[PDB]
Amino acid sequence: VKNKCVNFNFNGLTGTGVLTESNKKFLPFQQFGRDIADTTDAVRDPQTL
Amino acid sequence: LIANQFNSAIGKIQDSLSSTASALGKLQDVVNQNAQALNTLVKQLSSNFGAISSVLNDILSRLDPPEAEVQIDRLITGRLQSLQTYVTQQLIRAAE
Amino acid sequence: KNIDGYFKIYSKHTPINLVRDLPQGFSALEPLVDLPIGINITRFQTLLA
Numbered sequence A: 001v002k003n004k005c006v007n008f009n010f011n012g013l014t015g016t017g018v019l020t021e022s023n024k025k026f027l028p029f030q031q032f033g034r035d036i037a038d039t040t041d042a043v044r045d046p047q048t049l
Numbered sequence B: 001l002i003a004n005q006f007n008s009a010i011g012k013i014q015d016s017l018s019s020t021a022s023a024l025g026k027l028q029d030v031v032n033q034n035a036q037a038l039n040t041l042v043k044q045l046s047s048n049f050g051a052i053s054s055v056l057n058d059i060l061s062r063l064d065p066p067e068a069e070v071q072i073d074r075l076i077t078g079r080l081q082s083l084q085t086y087v088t089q090q091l092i093r094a095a096e
Numbered sequence C: 001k002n003i004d005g006y007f008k009i010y011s012k013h014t015p016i017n018l019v020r021d022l023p024q025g026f027s028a029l030e031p032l033v034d035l036p037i038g039i040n041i042t043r044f045q046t047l048l049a
């Protein structure tokens, strides 16, 4: 579910947030994004890339 | 004569402000010191404080309370001092 | 680089026209592959056609 406060567990990452489709373009190897303060902000969906 | 000196004087203020930012340094430091102090506060979250993981949800997820307590109690003591030191920084700066 | 019983490989294929030596510049290297042999590797050779 997108655009909704949903508790999410990605690859066993876990946490609660609002998941929205992102314009930032990951490099092929990268999997988990991070912020300036090193907080998980972007996650790459396993089943569908 | 006085008017012309006064009018030219104001004009000189524009150029010193327009070109050089070093004059306005004092205001910038309050922003820099403060904004920096937050970054130290936020970065502390990513510190283990002698525990298995810095991320709280990880410790909740992998291990159950009776032993999880010892892990979490270390995080709280670590973060709490970090919070306390940050506030005591602010109170000192606020008086200044 | 081989670490903690894992053998990692990185790569980059920048095109160059300076034939004498290594060009000045700064190209990042992506992780091409990871493969877990875990050996007491202490010597090295290359293979030329």
Ligand SMILES: *[C@@H]1O[C@H](CO)[C@@H](O[C@@H]2O[C@H](CO)[C@@H](O)[C@H](O)[C@H]2NC(C)=O)[C@H](O)[C@H]1NC(C)=O
Residues within 6 Å of the ligand: C040, C042
């Ligand atoms: C991997 O094999 C090498 C053998 O080439 C080991 O290096 C030897 O270690 C002993 C220590 O007990 C030294 O007395 C030898 O002089 C070493 N050989 C050389 C060529 O210096 C090495 O210790 C092995 N790796 C591990 C983790 O034990």
